[PDB]
Amino acid sequence: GPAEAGITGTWSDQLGDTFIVTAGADGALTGTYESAVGNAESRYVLTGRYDSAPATDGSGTALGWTVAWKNNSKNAHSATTWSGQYVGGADAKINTQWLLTSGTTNANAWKSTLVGHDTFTKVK
Amino acid sequence: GPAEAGITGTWSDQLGDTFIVTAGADGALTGTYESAVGNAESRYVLTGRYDSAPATDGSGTALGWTVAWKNNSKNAHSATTWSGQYVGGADAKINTQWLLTSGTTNANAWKSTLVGHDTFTKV
Amino acid sequence: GPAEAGITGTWSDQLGDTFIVTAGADGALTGTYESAVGNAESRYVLTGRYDSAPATDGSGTALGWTVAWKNNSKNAHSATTWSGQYVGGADAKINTQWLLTSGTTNANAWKSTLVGHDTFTKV
Amino acid sequence: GPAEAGITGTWSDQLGDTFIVTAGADGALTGTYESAVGNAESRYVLTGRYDSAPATDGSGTALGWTVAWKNNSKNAHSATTWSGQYVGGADAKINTQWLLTSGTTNANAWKSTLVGHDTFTKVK
Ligand SMILES: O=C(O)CCCC[C@@H]1SC[C@@H]2NC(=O)N[C@@H]21
Ligand SMILES: O=C(O)CCCC[C@@H]1SC[C@@H]2NC(=O)N[C@@H]21
Ligand SMILES: O=C(O)CCCC[C@@H]1SC[C@@H]2NC(=O)N[C@@H]21
Numbered sequence: 001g002p003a004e005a006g007i008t009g010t011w012s013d014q015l016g017d018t019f020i021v022t023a024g025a026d027g028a029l030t031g032t033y034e035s036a037v038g039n040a041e042s043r044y045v046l047t048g049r050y051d052s053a054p055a056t057d058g059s060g061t062a063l064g065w066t067v068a069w070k071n072n073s074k075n076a077h078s079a080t081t082w083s084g085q086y087v088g089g090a091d092a093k094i095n096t097q098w099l100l101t102s103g104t105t106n107a108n109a110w111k112s113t114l115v116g117h118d119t120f121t122k123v124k
Numbered sequence: 125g126p127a128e129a130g131i132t133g134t135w136s137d138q139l140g141d142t143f144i145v146t147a148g149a150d151g152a153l154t155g156t157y158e159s160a161v162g163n164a165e166s167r168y169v170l171t172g173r174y175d176s177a178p179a180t181d182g183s184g185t186a187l188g189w190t191v192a193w194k195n196n197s198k199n200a201h202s203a204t205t206w207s208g209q210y211v212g213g214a215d216a217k218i219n220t221q222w223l224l225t226s227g228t229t230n231a232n233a234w235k236s237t238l239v240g241h242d243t244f245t246k247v
Numbered sequence: 248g249p250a251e252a253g254i255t256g257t258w259s260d261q262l263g264d265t266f267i268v269t270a271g272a273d274g275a276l277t278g279t280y281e282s283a284v285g286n287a288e289s290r291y292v293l294t295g296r297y298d299s300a301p302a303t304d305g306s307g308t309a310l311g312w313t314v315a316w317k318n319n320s321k322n323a324h325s326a327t328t329w330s331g332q333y334v335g336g337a338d339a340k341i342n343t344q345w346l347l348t349s350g351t352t353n354a355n356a357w358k359s360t361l362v363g364h365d366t367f368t369k370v
Numbered sequence: 371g372p373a374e375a376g377i378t379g380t381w382s383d384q385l386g387d388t389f390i391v392t393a394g395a396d397g398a399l400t401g402t403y404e405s406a407v408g409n410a411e412s413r414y415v416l417t418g419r420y421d422s423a424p425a426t427d428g429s430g431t432a433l434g435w436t437v438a439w440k441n442n443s444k445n446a447h448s449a450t451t452w453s454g455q456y457v458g459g460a461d462a463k464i465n466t467q468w469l470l471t472s473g474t475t476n477a478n479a480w481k482s483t484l485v486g487h488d489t490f491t492k493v494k
């Protein structure tokens with residue numbers, strides 16, 4: 001439906017974090033992600049899931065994805081998930097909230113996870 | 125590293141939410157998840173990532189995964205991500221926080237996302 | 248410091264959720280909040296805290312507050328906390344993330360807490 | 371009702387973070403809080419709100435509170451809110467999720483906020 005093609009493409013946010021994704025008819029999200037901030041260099045594997053038959057009543061399309069911050073260049077020992085919804089239209093948006101967990105000892109687990117939000121806009 | 129075999133298997137929480145996962149040598153998590161609560165029936169595909177070369181200093185292994193709540197039986201128009209860490213050993217744990225976003229109209233978007241936390245133990 | 252007069256006043260977000268606050272010289276926030284959405288009518292008491300001696304290095308001023316959604320008109324059996332920072336200047340902002348917990352039975356507690364975010368600008 | 375007296379008293383969690391609170395008939399929570407972890411020393415002022423007429427159907431009592439991490443001994447330039455519900459009974463609990471925001475420059479705001487959860491049990 002329009003959400004598969006709508007989500008597929010390149011996205012970025014206002015900090016210049018950016019990702020390339022394909023949304024499949026099987027509900028899969030597959031791509032790579034590049035953060036402009038934090039302990040990250042170059043691109044990381046992204047995988048996730050989305051609702052391939054969203055409500056047709058004006059609602060967004062729910063989705064989520066994960067990046068573990070390890071690639072051939074760098075390993076931050078952390079992983080981020082983004083949970084949110086795709087809102088289509090000519091200026092499509094992906095609106096998300098995210099959790100960034102770092103590996104820690106049990107004693108430091110209380111400070112293991114950052115939370116934030118981010119809206120991405122489609123490049124093409 | 126040990127996290128590969130250690131994450132691979134079947135996990136559950138106190139409510140009987142459960143999942144089967146394989147942690148690949150490449151950092152992929154793939155499996156199936158079943159919720160005991162919510163607008164959910166039977167199993168849903170899970171996919172995520174973990175740090176396949178975690179620190180060796182006693183820290184946990186970071187990971188995350190997603191489930192979109194649509195399968196052959198039901199579609200709740202929602203998706204959950206779990207972000208957390210695997211803590212190994214013979215009674216291994218995966219400690220998570222989670223975000224459950226439901227598709228909403230823009231007017232309702234302020235109430236789209238629930239947050240919670242959950243500890244799974246290996247079956 | 249400037250945060251005292253700068254936080255004190257009336258604030259609103261894009262939806263018309265609004266609050267009046269006084270930031271005390273002692274670190275207290277006290278005021279009243281009105282939501283344009285949700286199970287809410289008229290004004291509710293707000294109370295919180297802010298760092299009354301923030302860093303001087305250009306950082307924002309940390310703060311937080313709570314509203315329990317019971318007043319003379321309505322009781323939604325819920326409470327929201329906002330955690331964030333005040334960024335001063337002539338177009339000052341309060342940038343927040345928030346947690347809205349509803350009273351639930353233990354069985355439903357996994358769905359008790361919504362999460363979101365909101366930026367307020369000063370009227 | 372039972373929730374006012376139920377919440378009033380001293381609470382602690384498994385790390386030995388602890389607080390003393392009074393829940394008022396006016397919906398107020400007033401007290402002080404002592405963290406066993408992080409950039410904190412001795413006690414900090416706590417203020418918050420709770421539902422003074424909770425549902426009588428088995429539901430918990432919603433509540434929340436704030437601590438800014440500045441006292442006469444220490445200033446961490448941060449503040450934490452806890453949002454959750456009081457569950458009464460002979461072994462009463464306060465179950466919460468929390469957000470800890472540090473003051474940051476706008477550039478570092480994406481890493482300003484930690485998230486976690488915590489269950490407190492009543493001391494007396
Ligand atoms: O520092 C790390 O642990 C690895 C990089 C984390 C970057 C975070 S993930 C949430 C936010 N969104 C971005 O694209 N970058 C930051
Ligand atoms: O109700 C829905 O929208 C779909 C089911 C959601 C179930 C949630 S996901 C977070 C928590 N953990 C579980 O295993 N189940 C609930
Ligand atoms: O529906 C309820 O349980 C009470 C009203 C909640 C309104 C929420 S609080 C977070 C967000 N910000 C607002 O100003 N309103 C919504």
Ligand SMILES: O=C(O)CCCC[C@@H]1SC[C@@H]2NC(=O)N[C@@H]21
Pocket residue numbers: 110387388404405406407408409410439446447448449450468470472486488
């Ligand atoms: O380091 C700081 O910025 C000040 C202390 C923060 C302590 C946090 S607040 C959430 C968690 N619960 C606790 O009682 N202590 C930690």
